[PDB]
Design a protein around this ligand. Structure first.
Ligand SMILES: Oc1ccc2c(c1)N[C@H](O)CC2
Length: 115
């Protein structure tokens, strides 16, 4: 509260660390469904069903232009990619499995890096 400050983690390297994690996700062999925004004009249902589209190239642009105020807002966008994937794809599909794999991959990096 006012004039009562909690000690806080050193956040000075967060930008660099999130960038490294994003690079690792961009180069994962199962990243192909998530590299670019889904084409809302060509993919039936996607625009109406998925209220907040997100993809790695959009996350990269936001990270490169100071649009994440902290590391948690970055993690929210990453998770959103995988949440959107689950909404739109059966678990037993190539893209469905890709999303599950990439989520698992991300969360271990996240834990190992910041926890
Ligand atoms: O067969 C298809 C064709 C296009 C897409 C998907 C499956 N799922 C992705 O989540 C997004 C776009």
């Amino acid at each position: 509260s006012m004039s009562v400050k909690k000690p806080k983690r050193d956040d000075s390297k967060d930008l660099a660390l999130c960038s490294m994690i994003l690079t690792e996700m961009e180069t994962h062999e199962d990243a192909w469904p998530f590299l670019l925004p889904v084409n809302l004009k060509l993919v039936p249902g996607y625009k109406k069903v998925i209220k907040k589209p997100m993809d790695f190239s959009t996350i990269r642009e936001k990270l490169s232009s100071g649009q994440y105020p902290n590391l948690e807002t970055f993690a929210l966008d990453v998770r959103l990619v995988f949440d959107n994937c689950e909404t739109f794809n059966e678990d037993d599909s190539d893209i469905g499995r890709a999303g599950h794999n990439m989520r698992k991959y991300f969360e271990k990096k996240w834990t190992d890096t910041f926890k």
